[PDB]
Design a protein around this ligand. Structure first.
Ligand SMILES: NC(=O)c1ccc[n+]([C@@H]2O[C@H](COP(=O)([O-])OP(=O)(O)OC[C@H]3O[C@@H](n4cnc5c(N)ncnc54)[C@H](OP(=O)(O)O)[C@@H]3O)[C@@H](O)[C@H]2O)c1
Ligand SMILES: NC(=O)c1ccc[n+]([C@@H]2O[C@H](COP(=O)([O-])OP(=O)(O)OC[C@H]3O[C@@H](n4cnc5c(N)ncnc54)[C@H](OP(=O)(O)O)[C@@H]3O)[C@@H](O)[C@H]2O)c1
Ligand SMILES: CCOC(=O)[C@H]1C[C@@H]1c1ccc(O)c(OC)c1
Ligand SMILES: CCOC(=O)[C@H]1C[C@@H]1c1ccc(O)c(OC)c1
Lengths: 310, 310
């Protein structure tokens, strides 16, 4: 009906699949752009059975992108780091088509316009800033989403629940606060804000009060849930910093991000601005899965671990 | 004709594919065991077009393995680290069938019975030793292959030829010697020795005199080949050792191996034993691609990088 038509790039991705499912769950006509050679064949079939329209092609196909843009209203990009500046191909098509009502570039992490990181990570988020500056320069309607930490991803990474080991690695002192959100919710809320007038040309941050914690607190709560105690092994901050300078790329990128997230506490090191919008306060009919609920999920039916591409 | 029939486990793997191709090139009837859900569909079609017989199944299918064992003469395992002890399923089937003429377990690296490493790596090669002990206890005919370093893999890992950076990382002093061999050759030679009476119940080491070098010498030669100088950044040994103790698994495994190969120089830290067989001395009609030739290949048509499973 009146539902805005949504085009998602990187829909088969780690976080992208949750945006595709959330879009369909909310009854939005959904277009998924995917490479002809993608190995996400079975995932694409699932999307198709849920009602999505699959469009195979390459970002280099300018004409195809323009013709596709003319058929939709909202464009969301969930592409990976290696393709951040490739989003300029998406942006060029949006500019030519001229009918797009909202563009959400691939952020879904830290709020890059208010935080700085070590060189390895700073270079990547500087690219995301370049995208933002171009959007604003062209007066393209947007929404910048800071989803903070992907919860299943980091519960898997930090707690290694699928590992029977007796020790646990802590980065830095482990006292830095951070916020983490369940991927399924990140996906749903992203679709909601992409069409909410309250998020037009604004930064939206996902920071529900029930999802703020520190590494030590997460370990403690997990220990209580499963009835086991771990020996905590800390990796000194100076140690982490040194590695970012000596290790090659892309090996040093994760290290620099670990420093930014769990040592500097970038997802919780700032206060909200006047124009900022915190997503959990937007829909009284929805809520973010809490940390206790998340841990329960890992006790009853834990999701597989993942590793971002660099 | 009268060629021995070869069954390869993990044939679709990084080194495994080179063994399958080498087996077919040498005219051996070749059986490839692969999981029903493998994503190596296009590689499998290639094997098939080359003459290989594909057999889909799981290692847990004891009866299937036994009936398969009965149809072949030689069994080679190129499975990954996570499945080392899973090789006991292959061994049980071999014991029951009773007709196998030679079994080559998944080693193709350092000579585990004469070297020791840091805990992260020591645990993995200890498993490989367990397999070797069971083979000998059961009087199963074997050949243990120490292929040393996979060259394309490590030229990519150490030189990052696909990276236009001005710096290069050196592990330790960079003075430790190591031997590396081209994957295509490792595969060919493995098939040759699997049927050479000279390799029956012996350790075979791939160490051609033209393929021995240090990190610094490798960097130097690469610099001359491409006409560019790099800034060398060293990672102290004590630094590498500390990481193996603080970083969680699997992350700490590669670090421990880097120490073993490029700091301890495990592939060149020993002299040959009386019963050792150095493969390059075996066939006057063949030879290992040299380091110079390997570098030339990376200048004209470099192979993509890779990452072992942990
Ligand atoms: N906040 C956090 O904790 C967190 C965690 C992870 C990631 N992130 C962020 O979330 C965003 C997406 O990350 P992700 O892990 O979801 O991405 P991903 O799964 O690695 O990749 C997303 C999609 O990119 C497409 N793609 C891959 N290579 C491509 C290429 N060469 N050219 C064109 N398309 C290509 C693929 O789709 P097809 O195969 O269909 O073409 C893939 O499904 C990024 O901005 C990332 O930084 C944040
Ligand atoms: N010397 C060196 O520099 C070096 C470098 C790398 C590796 N290595 C060694 O070479 C050997 C093989 O390494 P690799 O990297 O070639 O192996 P790989 O490519 O990681 O895997 C080999 C094969 O295992 C099968 N497999 C994967 N997961 C499985 C599971 N859960 N159950 C059963 N089968 C599974 C897959 O075949 P299907 O999909 O067909 O089932 C896969 O192609 C190892 O012993 C390794 O340590 C040495
Ligand atoms: C440290 C292990 O995870 C990562 O390397 C990257 C994928 C994680 C990530 C990527 C981009 C981000 O903005 C972010 O902040 C929440 C987190
Ligand atoms: C350092 C990056 O590579 C590795 O972590 C492992 C795959 C490399 C390897 C695995 C097993 C080995 O025996 C070996 O010695 C030559 C090398």
């Amino acid at each position: 009906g009146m539902k805005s038509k949504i085009l998602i790039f990187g829909g088969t991705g780690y976080i992208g699949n949750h945006m595709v499912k959330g879009s369909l769950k909310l009854g939005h006509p959904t277009y998924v752009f995917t490479r002809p050679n993608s190995s996400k064949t079975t995932l694409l079939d699932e999307f198709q059975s849920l009602g999505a329209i699959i469009v195979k092609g390459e970002l280099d196909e300018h004409e195809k992108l323009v013709e596709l843009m003319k058929k939709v209203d909202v464009v969301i990009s969930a592409l990976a780091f290696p393709q951040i500046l490739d989003q300029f191909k998406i942006l060029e098509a949006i500019k030519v088509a001229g009918n797009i009502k909202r563009f959400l570039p691939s952020d879904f992490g830290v709020e890059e316009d208010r935080i700085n990181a070590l060189p390895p990570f700073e270079a990547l988020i500087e690219r995301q800033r370049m995208i933002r500056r171009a959007i604003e320069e062209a007066n393209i309607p947007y929404t910048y989403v800071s989803a903070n930490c992907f919860a299943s991803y980091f519960i898997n990474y930090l707690l290694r629940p699928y590992d029977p080991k007796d020790e646990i690695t802590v980065y830095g002192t482990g006292e830095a606060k951070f916020a983490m959100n369940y991927e399924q919710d990140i996906g749903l809320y992203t679709i909601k804000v992409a069409t909410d007038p309250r998020a037009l040309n604004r930064v939206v941050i996902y920071r529900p009060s029930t999802n703020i914690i520190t590494q030590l607190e997460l370990i403690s709560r997990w220990e209580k849930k499963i009835g086991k105690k771990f020996k905590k092994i800390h990796v000194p901050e100076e140690e982490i910093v040194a590695l970012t300078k000596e290790l090659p790329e892309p090996e040093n990128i994760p290290i620099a991000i670990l420093h930014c997230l769990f040592i500097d506490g970038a997802t919780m090191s700032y206060d909200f601005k006047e124009n900022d919008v915190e997503a959990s306060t937007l829909y009284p009919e929805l809520k973010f899965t809490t940390i206790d609920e998340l841990l329960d999920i890992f006790v009853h039916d834990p999701p597989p671990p993942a590793s971002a591409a660099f």
